């Protein structure tokens, strides 16, 4: 298994995971440490705590990233280079910033770092989704997770050691910038699968538009060359609704023939442009306009910039069959791990009665090493074994690890038993993490992997966010061993939903494409409307939260609004999930 690591792609994946992980701890945790040694609350500023929301709400930033292709490098690589450049500049600026004058804009710069870091995460996740082959998806996710954890470790756990010694905060931040530099260089060395039939067709149309000025001929030749390259590139690509019909199907034969005719017309136009001809070129250009008004609309003869730039990822994802089943699976697959890690610290402090320092050291060392090793082992099992079966095994192992936590709670206190049990739990957590990131990368349509991956990451995090309270209420009501038994039984539904959607998962693994539901008659649109209403209610509640935070006016009904919005949203989700299961059942027979 050393061969994959010997390949440079593993190295670039590791370094980019490091690049993504570095700003997370520096943005908040290291900043909490700096404010704590300064004794500053870092609250009431109201610019801070946007840094936490920046990662959560990255799916709002994503559509510009999946829509826009930077002129330098490619879409993924160019956005990555840009985002790392802004991060490096911002960290260097904060290091340059002198607290001697005032706090000035430390919180604003932290929010800028958080926005640029959520941006870089989006772009790295998209680049990792597209660049990684299907069987390599698991191992690449494992390496990315390893680099991510290592970045969090250096920015969060080496930060105190470095700051307490001679290096100081200014040099610490500039050294983080320097460690970001080879991430930028390696991003330049990173591969780029720009692909994108939509992007190639948009280049085709942009150059055709700059060619409608065909009286100057100082631009028609170059623009026609760009059109020909884009058309040749888009001919070998696959259009939407035809991705599953890859091996020379009649539909893709018509696609290829249409692009054959198109590139022939670019041949004629370039023949006339190379002559330097004005009049003949213009006559055959009017004929070209007629033929494009007659022939070439067959496959996506449309512009690219649209509201769709932001709607198309969601439209596609929801258009896929078993979309809501996958939505719920993403939400509650890591539910057991969220339950365990939410209260592991307090359980070790009180439930098993360990000393705080012992718990801190054993967690910091064993949990981190176990998550890393589980990530690697999960990835190697992923390249060995299919996605669905590996997710099944790793979810079952997550449940049995929570069962090990129940063993710990019932069993008398021992450092060694706690060590082995927490190592097993974090081992299964790392394996499930690698398999889950692989699943996220599998689900993205790659055409817009940034937006769909950001949606799925927010989906995974929404479970974790709501986990904390329910775990606290459960432990206070029923105790710790009963809580961990329920933790196992709540990790079960993720496995159950995986078993439900195993047909879709195996289909996607083998064909690399998704079915789009043809079963929609009236109910699917109803569930989509329910979700849209839930999202609008969430946005309105966020506006109310801002109004309450500014404290000009406050209305107590916002809590009920939250509960009602959650009820409607989950109602839509379950309705869609039941429809999705019914559609899968219909496809089965």
């Amino acid at each position: 298994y050393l061969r994959i690591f010997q390949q440079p792609k593993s190295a670039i994946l590791l370094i980019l995971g490091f690049a993504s992980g570095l700003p997370l701890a520096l943005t908040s945790g290291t900043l909490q440490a700096w404010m704590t040694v300064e004794n500053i609350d870092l609250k009431t500023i109201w610019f801070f705590s946007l840094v936490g929301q920046a990662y959560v709400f990255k799916f709002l930033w994503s559509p510009v990233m999946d829509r826009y292709t930077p002129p330098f490098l490619g879409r993924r690589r160019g956005w990555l280079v840009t985002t790392q450049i802004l991060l490096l500049i911002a960290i260097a600026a904060m290091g340059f910033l002198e607290p001697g004058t005032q706090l000035r804009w430390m919180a604003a710069l932290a929010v800028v770092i958080a926005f640029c870091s959520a941006s870089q995460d989006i772009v790295f996740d998209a680049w990792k989704t597209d660049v990684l082959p299907a069987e390599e998806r698991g191992t690449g996710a494992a390496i990315s997770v390893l680099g991510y954890r290592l970045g969090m470790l250096v920015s969060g756990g080496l930060a105190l050691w470095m700051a307490d010694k001679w290096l100081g905060w200014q040099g610490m931040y500039w050294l983080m910038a320097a460690l970001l530099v080879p991430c930028i260089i390696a991003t330049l060395l990173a591969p780029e699968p720009s692909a994108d039939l939509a992007d190639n067709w948009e280049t085709l149309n942009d150059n055709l538009k700059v060619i409608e000025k065909a009286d100057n001929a100082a631009q028609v030749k170059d623009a026609l060359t760009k059109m020909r390259a884009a058309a040749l590139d888009a001919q070998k690509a696959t259009p939407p609704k035809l991705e599953d019909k890859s091996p020379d199907s009649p539909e893709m034969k018509d696609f290829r023939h249409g692009f054959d005719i198109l590139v022939g017309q670019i041949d004629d136009a370039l023949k006339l442009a190379n002559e330097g001809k004005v009049k003949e070129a213009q006559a055959a250009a009017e004929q070209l306009k007629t033929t494009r008004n007659a022939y070439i609309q067959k496959y996506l003869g449309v512009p690219r910039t649209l509201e769709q730039a932001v709607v198309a990822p969601l439209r596609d994802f929801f258009g896929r069959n078993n979309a809501w089943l996958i939505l719920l699976l993403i939400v509650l697959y890591k539910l057991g791990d969220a339950f365990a890690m939410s209260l592991t610290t307090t359980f070790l402090i009180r439930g098993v009665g360990f000393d705080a320092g012992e718990v801190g050291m054993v967690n910091k060392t064993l949990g981190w090493i176990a998550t890393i090793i589980g990530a690697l082992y999960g990835g190697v099992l992923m390249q060995r074994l299919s996605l669905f079966r590996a997710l099944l095994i790793f979810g079952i192992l997550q449940g049995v690890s929570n069962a090990g936590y129940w063993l710990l709670s019932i069993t008398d206190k021992h450092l060694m038993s706690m060590a082995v049990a927490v190592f097993f739990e974090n081992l299964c957590g790392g394996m499930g993490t690698a398999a889950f990131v692989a699943l996220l990368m599998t689900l993205c349509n790659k055409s817009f992997s940034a937006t769909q991956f950001a949606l799925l990451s927010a989906l995974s995090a929404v479970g974790r966010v709501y986990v904390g309270p329910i775990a606290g209420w459960f432990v206070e009501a029923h105790g710790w061993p009963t809580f961990y038994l329920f933790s196992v039984f709540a990790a079960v539904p993720g496995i159950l939903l995986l078993l439900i959607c195993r047909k879709t998962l195996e289909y996607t693994q083998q064909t690399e494409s998704f079915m789009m539901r043809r079963h929609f008659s009236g109910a699917y649109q109803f569930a989509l409307y329910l979700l849209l209403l839930g999202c609008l209610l969430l946005a309105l509640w966020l506006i109310m939260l801002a109004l309450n935070a500014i404290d000009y006016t406050s209305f107590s009904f916002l809590a009920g609004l939250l509960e009602v919005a959650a009820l409607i949203a989950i109602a839509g989700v379950l309705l869609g999930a039941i429809l999705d299961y019914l559609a899968l059942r219909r496809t089965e027979e």
Partner: antibody, heavy 124, light 109 residues
Framework: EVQLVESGGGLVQPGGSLRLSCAASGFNVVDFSLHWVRQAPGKGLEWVAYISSSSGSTSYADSVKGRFTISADTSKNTAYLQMNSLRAEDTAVYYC?????????????????WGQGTLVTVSS | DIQMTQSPSSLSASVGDRVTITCRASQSVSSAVAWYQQKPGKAPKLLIYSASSLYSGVPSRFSGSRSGTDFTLTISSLQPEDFATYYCQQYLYYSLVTFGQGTKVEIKR
């Protein structure tokens, strides 16, 4: 079973201007566009010109435009490159390669068959 | 005819050693890049067309790959007869068909 033999030697005045004949055997001259590629002694290849006998299309390099004229005789299945106003760096080996029709794999097989080349040179 | 500056200008690899020669197109040329092997005193031979593609029964020692505008020709198992001059030729635009630089090295032995 095809080849592009290039010739043209004969009784001609030295220090003038000569045309390079590229006889195509095993395939019609109209089915493949013939491109003259110039390899100067000591440096790499450089596409000099091309003719598309199917439609009469013709193109040249920037360094040879206005002085060269590439034609093609479909009757005898051969191409020509009448090089005029030859200059010191015009000396090179001229391989008449072929290049298929678009659309299809013939186009993607760019220069799938070349010719042994003729060493055009200026001397005494 | 200007690319990025590289410390190695030529290629020299042992027999049986996998070696790669790469050139980056100025602009996107799609998969329309061909690789030719020209032994001295002989016309170039089309090794790889479409920058990765080859038919059945063709030599399999030579391989090609493309990522964006970057094209790489790799020889899996280098052979004594492999030593020649390799040209990367984008073949998209007729009037500006561009080629490689050159590689003049004896048979590494």
């Amino acid at each position: 079973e095809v080849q592009l033999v290039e010739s043209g030697g004969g009784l001609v005045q030295p220090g003038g201007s000569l045309r390079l004949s590229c006889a195509a055997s095993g395939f019609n001259v109209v089915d493949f566009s013939l491109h003259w590629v110039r390899q100067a002694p000591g440096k790499g290849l450089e596409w000099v010109a091309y003719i598309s006998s199917s439609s009469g299309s013709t193109s040249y390099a920037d360094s040879v435009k206005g002085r060269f004229t590439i034609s093609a005789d479909t009757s005898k299945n051969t191409a020509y490159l009448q090089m005029n106003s030859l200059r010191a760096e015009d000396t090179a080996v001229y391989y008449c390669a072929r290049w298929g029709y678009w659309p299809g794999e013939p186009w993607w097989k760019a220069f799938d068959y070349w010719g042994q080349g003729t060493l055009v040179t200026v001397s005494s | 005819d200007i690319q990025m500056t590289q410390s190695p200008s030529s290629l020299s690899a042992s027999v049986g050693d996998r070696v790669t020669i790469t050139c980056r197109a100025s602009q996107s040329v799609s998969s329309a890049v061909a690789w030719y092997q020209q032994k001295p005193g002989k016309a170039p031979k089309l090794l790889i067309y479409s920058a990765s593609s080859l038919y059945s029964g063709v030599p399999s020692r030579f391989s090609g790959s493309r990522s964006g505008t970057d094209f790489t020709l790799t020889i899996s198992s280098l052979q004594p007869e492999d030593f020649a001059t390799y040209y990367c030729q984008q073949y998209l635009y007729y009037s500006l068909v561009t080629f490689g630089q050159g590689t003049k090295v004896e048979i590494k032995r």
